[PDB]
Amino acid sequence: GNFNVAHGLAWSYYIGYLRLILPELQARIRTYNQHYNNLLRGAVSQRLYILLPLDCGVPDNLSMADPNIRFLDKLPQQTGDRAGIKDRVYSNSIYELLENGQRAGTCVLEYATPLQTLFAMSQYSQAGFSREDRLEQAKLFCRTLEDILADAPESQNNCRLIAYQEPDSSFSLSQEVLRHLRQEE
Amino acid sequence: FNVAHGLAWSYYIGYLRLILPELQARIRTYNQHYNAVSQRLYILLPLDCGVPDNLSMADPNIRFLDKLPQQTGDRAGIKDRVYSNSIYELLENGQRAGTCVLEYATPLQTLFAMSQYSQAGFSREDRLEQAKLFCRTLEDILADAPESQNNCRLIAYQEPDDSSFSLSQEVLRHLRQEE
Ligand SMILES: Nc1nc2c(ncn2[C@@H]2O[C@@H]3COP(=O)(O)O[C@H]4[C@@H](O)[C@H](n5cc(-c6ccc(-c7ccccc7)cc6)c6c(N)ncnc65)O[C@@H]4COP(=O)(O)O[C@@H]2[C@@H]3O)c(=O)[nH]1
């Protein structure tokens, strides 16, 4: 039950998003860094950072949560004709991570959108899922996504999953991403 | 408590509930002096999960006419995330017989891809059952969201090398019945 739901969303996240964008991402980041960002310490990192809040709380504005996360720019758009929709575009947003009034990191950052479906399905009676089902579904989504990416040809050190339990006044989202960014080289 | 339920709720929560409230107004912004499209989104639900990215590949009598004005929304850390819809003309005897906003349900293409990947654990018999569950679940969601139900028509069909079936003729039947 909680397995089959998470399993389906994780695969849909891969087939309809990650497998299509991850192959070209490093070229899009490289082009951006070469032409638009000649800051020797302000380079966009080479990986998509995907935020997996395990409570499934996904704000549509990622900057609002944390004064130390500021929207910088959009990467160059990627467009595809998909199921009779001409030029279905994929956009990715670059964010500035601030630490002690200084820029500490710059990366392509987003939430995993499917967690918003797990939240909704816990809220609507017709879906038939409790809040304890949603936590199990969030965990199994993360584990299934990690398992897909481990054997995926399009995952070439170009994707990092960031999972955390904090929904909070003692939690810094910028600090959470900065710890992952700094661990890599 | 299955794959189709998650795909159905994702289709509603992540697409239909956000574009259908604005669709009729986007039409107007297309319906200009030089521009007779119906004000409903036509969603094709092929149970075989055979979803061509180009609708003209399925039936040569469906031809791309134009894109409707792009819808943008800030979504889950992505600002200016665009939602795009295509207008198609339906030919009858080489001449336009109808125009509508037409597309396949994208999640059925995921069920198809999932049936191709060994790691997904999904047989071809599992895919048909989940295709059917996807359609049934989406319909029950929209039957409790009439703000969305009056703005889209769901067309679920099974195509057994069956030359007796014309997708253009089937959509034209629904368009003329509506009117
Ligand atoms: N982060 C990011 N995730 C993406 C993007 N694409 C796709 N996924 C995610 O990959 C999984 C599989 O995608 P599918 O294609 O299989 O199923 C879709 C499709 O049927 C229909 N649908 C959805 C969109 C759409 C989806 C997400 C975004 C978005 C953009 C930025 C941040 C957050 C979300 C924008 C649009 C869509 C569209 N723009 N035009 C026509 N139809 C569409 O609704 C279904 C559920 O959508 P979902 O729950 O939002 O997220 C989907 C889904 O979880 C992307 O560009 N960005």
Swiss-Prot record, chain B:
Changing S10A: Slight decrease in c-di-GMP-binding. Renders the enzyme sensitive to 5,6-dimethylxanthenone 4-acetic acid (DMXAA) drug, leading to activation of the STING1 pathway. Changing G6 to S/V: Partially constitutively active mutant that promotes the production of type I interferon in absence of cGAMP ligand. 3',3'-c-di-GMP binds at S10, Y15, R81, V82, Y83, S84, T106. Residues 1-179 are annotated as: Cyclic dinucleotide-binding domain (CBD). Changing F1A: Partially constitutively active mutant that promotes the production of type I interferon in absence of cGAMP ligand. 2',3'-cGAMP binds at S10, Y15, R81, T106. Phosphorylation by TBK1 leads to activation and production of IFN-beta. The phosphorylated pLxIS motif constitutes an IRF3-binding motif, leading to recruitment of the transcription factor IRF3 to induce type-I interferons and other cytokines. The phosphorylated pLxIS motif facilitates SENP2 recruitment during late phase of viral infection. Phosphorylated on tyrosine residues upon MHC-II aggregation. Ubiquitinated. Changing R81A: Abolished cGAMP-binding. Abolished ability to induce autophagy. Residues 1-179 are cytoplasmic. The modification Phosphoserine is found at S84. The modification Phosphothreonine is found at T72. Changing Q109I: Renders the enzyme sensitive to 5,6-dimethylxanthenone 4-acetic acid (DMXAA) drug, leading to activation of the STING1 pathway. The cGAS-STING signaling pathway drives sterile inflammation leading to type I interferon immunopathology in severe COVID-19 disease caused by SARS-CoV-2 virus infection. Tissue damages in the lung and skin lesions are caused by activation of the cGAS-STING signaling leading to aberrant inflammation. Endothelial cell damage is also caused by activation of the cGAS-STING pathway: SARS-CoV-2 infection triggers mitochondrial DNA release into the cytosol. It is linked to STING-associated vasculopathy, infantile-onset: An autoinflammatory disease characterized by early-onset systemic inflammation and cutaneous vasculopathy, resulting in severe skin lesions. Violaceous, scaling lesions of fingers, toes, nose, cheeks and ears progress to acral necrosis in most of the patients. Some patients have severe interstitial lung disease. Facilitator of innate immune signaling that acts as a sensor of cytosolic DNA from bacteria and viruses and promotes the production of type I interferon (IFN-alpha and IFN-beta). Innate immune response is triggered in response to non-CpG double-stranded DNA from viruses and bacteria delivered to the cytoplasm. Acts by binding cyclic dinucleotides: recognizes and binds cyclic di-GMP (c-di-GMP), a second messenger produced by bacteria, cyclic UMP-AMP (2',3'-cUAMP), and cyclic GMP-AMP (cGAMP), a messenger produced by CGAS in response to DNA virus in the cytosol. In absence of cGAMP, the transmembrane and cytoplasmic regions interact to form an integrated, domain-swapped dimeric assembly. In absence of cyclic nucleotide (c-di-GMP or cGAMP), the protein is autoinhibited by an intramolecular interaction between the cyclic dinucleotide-binding domain (CBD) and the C-terminal tail (CTT). Following cGAMP-binding, the cyclic dinucleotide-binding domain (CBD) is closed, leading to a 180 degrees rotation of the CBD domain relative to the transmembrane domain. This is Stimulator of interferon genes protein. It comes from Homo sapiens (Human). The lineage of its organism: Eukaryota, Metazoa, Chordata, Craniata, Vertebrata.
